[PDB]
C-alpha cells in the first residue's frame, strides 16, 4: 500500500529533525511549473529528480543516507546544492524559434533552489509538438535536448521516450503540492 | 514460471511492456510496419548477462533503464510511440535507437580502486552503443570514500558493490538494499 509513501515521509521528517536547517525537502516541494500547459513537460524532464531530496552539503547527504541505511529505509537521492557541479543556463537558446528553456517555465521559491534546477533541467527545451521537438533536437550536428507538451523527450544521446497517459497522471502531483502549500 | 520475474517487476513497469506489445500486435493485424517489429530487439535486461557478484551494482546503476527498449532506429521509436499515445496506452517507454545513439568515451583512471562496469557485461556487439549509453559512464569502486574522490575528480559515476552511488556531478544515492533475489537473477533463470 501507500505505506511506502508514508514511510519515506517519516524518514524525511526524522532527518529534518536530525540536521535542522540542512534538509530542504524534495524538489517537488520547492518549485512549480509556471503554467498548466507545461506541467507534463516539466514532469518528464525532471523525472526522478522530482523526488530527489535537496540538502546543503555532501556531508548532510552522506549522514542522511547513513541514517536511512541503519533504519532499513528505501534508497533516496540527495542533491547537495552547494556541492553540485553545474554550469549556468545557455541563454542563447532562448533565441531558437519554436522552443523555450524548460527551466524558464519553472518557478522556485528559495533562490538557491536554482542550483538544483540547473542540475535537473540543464539546457532542456520545450516545444509545442513532437515534430517541432524532433526537428530542433536532431536537426543539427549539435543536438538539443527537447520535450514536447505530451512528454515525448528527445535527448542529445539520441534516446527517445514517452508515454503520455502515465505522464499526465504523474503531473497531477504538482497541483497537490501547491494546495499543501 | 517466468511470472516470478513479472512479480518482481512492478505493474507500472510491466504496463509499458504490455502496451508496446499491443502496438506491435496492432501493426501486425493491419499488415503494416514490419520494419518496426524487425527493428525491435527487446529490453536491456533481456540482452545482457553478468556474473552474480555484479547483480546489485549493475541493477542499481540501471534502475528502470533495465527496461529501456533496444530498437534499430528513431523511425522504429517514433512510430511505436505515436501509436502508443494514439491508443492512450499506459506505461512509459524509452528507446535506444541504434542508428542515432551518440556515446562519448571518457577517461577511466587505471586503478585497482575502480573498474569499468561496462566490461563486466556480456552482450551482443550489435547493441554496443545501447550498452555504452547505459553503462559506459559508471565505475565500480572499492568504497564510498574512493567513490567520493573519483566521481569528484573525473567524469564518471561511481558505485560500490553494495550499491552506494556518487554521481560525477555530486548526486548521492543510498539506502537499505534487500537480500531478495535480484531481477537479474530471476531473468538468468528464464534464459
Alpha carbon distance A43, B55 (integer Å): 30
Closest listed residue to residue B103, CA positions, set B57, B134, B140 = B134
Q: State the DSSP code for A149.
A: T
Alpha carbon distance B130, B55 (integer Å): 19
Residue that is written with C-alpha cell 497517459 in the block: A165
Alpha carbon distance B95, B138 (integer Å): 20
3-state helix/strand/coil string of chain B: CCHHHHHCCCHHHHHHHHHHHHHHHHHHHCCCCHHHHHCEEEEHHHCCECCHHHHHHHHHHHHHHHHCEEECCHHHHHHHHHHHHHCCCCCCEEEEECCCCCCCCCCCCCECCEEECHHHCECCHHHHHHHHHHHCCEEEECCHHHHHHHHHHCCCEEEECCCCEECCCCCEEECCCCCCCCHHHHHHHHC
Domain range spanning residue A3? 1-181
Provide the shortest C-alpha distance from residue B170 to chain A (in Å).
5
Q: How were these coordinates obtained?
A: X-ray
Mutation target among B85, B133, B167 for the A interface, most CBs of A within 10 A = B85
Percent of residues in chain A assigned helix, strand, coil, to nearest 5: 55, 15, 30
Tell me, in Å, the resolution of the deposited structure.
Answer: 2.0
Q: What size, in residues, is chain B?
A: 191
CB B89 within 8 A of CB A164: no
- Residue A6 CA from chain centroid, whole number: 21
Three cell numbers, residue A148: 514536447
Alpha carbon distance A8, A51 (integer Å): 11
Closest-CA residue of chain A to B19: A163
SS3 call for A161: strand
Closest Cβ opposite residue B170 in set A85, A152, A161: A85
Give yes or no for B180 touching A (CB within 8 A): no
Provide the shortest C-alpha distance from residue B51 to chain A (in Å).
24
Give yes or no for A85 touching B (CB within 8 A): yes
Closest listed residue to residue A44, CA positions, set A147, A145, A174 = A147
The domain total for chain A is 1
Tell me the torsion sign for CA atoms B2, B3, B9, B13.
positive
Q: Which residues pair with B80 in a beta bridge?
A: none
Closest listed residue to residue A163, CA positions, set B17, B124, B139, B172 = B17
Closest listed residue to residue A79, CA positions, set A100, A99, A96, A64 = A64
Start-end of H helices in chain A:
3-18, 39-46, 58-71, 114-121, 130-138, 164-170, 172-180
Q: Which residues pair with B57 in a beta bridge?
A: none
Mutation target among B97, B175, B178 for the A interface, most CBs of A within 10 A = B175
Burial (0-12, 13-18, 19+ Cβ within 10 Å), A104? middle
CB B20 within 8 A of CB B95: no
Amino acid at each position: 500500500e501507500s505505506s511506502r509513501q508514508q514511510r519515506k515521509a517519516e524518514i524525511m521528517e526524522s532527518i529534518k529533525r536530525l540536521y535542522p536547517g540542512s534538509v530542504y525537502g524534495r524538489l517537488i516541494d520547492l518549485c512549480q511549473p509556471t503554467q498548466k500547459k507545461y506541467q507534463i513537460a516539466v514532469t518528464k524532464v525532471l523525472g526522478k529528480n522530482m523526488d530527489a531530496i535537496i540538502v546543503d552539503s555532501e556531508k548532510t547527504g552522506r549522514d542522511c543516507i547513513q541514517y536511512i541505511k541503519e533504519q532499513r529505509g528505501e534508497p533516496e537521492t540527495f542533491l547537495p546544492l552547494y556541492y553540485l557541479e553545474v554550469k549556468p543556463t545557455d541563454e542563447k537558446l532562448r533565441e531558437l524559434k519554436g522552443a523555450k528553456l524548460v527551466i524558464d517555465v519553472i518557478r522556485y521559491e528559495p533562490p538557491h533552489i536554482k542550483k538544483a534546477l540547473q542540475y535537473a533541467c540543464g539546457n532542456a527545451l520545450v516545444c509545442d509538438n513532437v515534430e517541432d521537438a524532433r526537428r530542433i533536437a536532431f536537426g543539427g550536428h549539435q543536438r538539443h535536448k527537447t520535450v514536447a507538451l505530451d512528454g515525448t523527450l528527445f535527448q542529445k544521446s539520441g534516446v527517445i521516450s514517452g508515454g503520455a497517459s502515465d505522464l499526465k497522471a504523474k503531473a497531477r502531483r504538482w497541483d497537490e503540492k501547491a494546495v499543501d502549500k | 514460471k517466468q511470472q516470478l520475474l513479472r512479480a518482481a517487476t512492478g505493474k507500472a513497469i510491466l504496463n509499458g511492456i504490455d502496451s508496446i506489445n499491443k502496438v506491435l500486435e496492432h501493426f501486425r493485424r493491419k499488415g503494416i510496419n514490419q520494419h518496426v517489429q524487425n527493428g525491435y530487439h527487446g529490453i536491456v535486461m533481456n540482452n545482457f548477462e553478468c556474473e552474480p557478484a555484479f547483480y546489485t551494482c549493475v541493477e542499481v546503476t540501471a534502475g528502470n533503464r533495465l527496461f529501456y527498449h533496444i530498437v534499430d532506429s528513431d523511425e522504429v521509436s517514433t512510430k511505436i510511440l505515436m501509436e502508443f499515445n494514439k491508443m492512450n496506452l499506459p506505461g512509459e517507454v524509452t528507446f535506444l535507437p541504434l542508428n542515432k545513439l551518440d556515446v562519448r568515451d571518457t577517461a577511466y583512471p587505471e586503478t585497482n580502486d575502480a573498474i569499468p562496469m561496462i566490461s563486466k557485461l556480456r552482450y551482443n556487439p550489435r547493441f554496443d552503443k545501447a550498452f555504452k549509453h547505459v553503462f559506459g559512464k559508471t565505475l565500480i569502486c572499492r568504497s564510498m570514500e574512493v567513490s567520493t574522490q573519483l566521481a569528484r575528480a573525473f567524469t564518471m559515476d561511481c558505485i560500490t558493490l553494495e550499491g552506494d552511488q556518487v554521481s560525477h556531478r555530486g548526486a548521492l544515492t543510498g539506502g537499505y538494499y534487500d537480500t531478495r533475489k535480484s531481477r537479474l537473477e530471476l531473468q538468468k533463470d528464464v534464459r
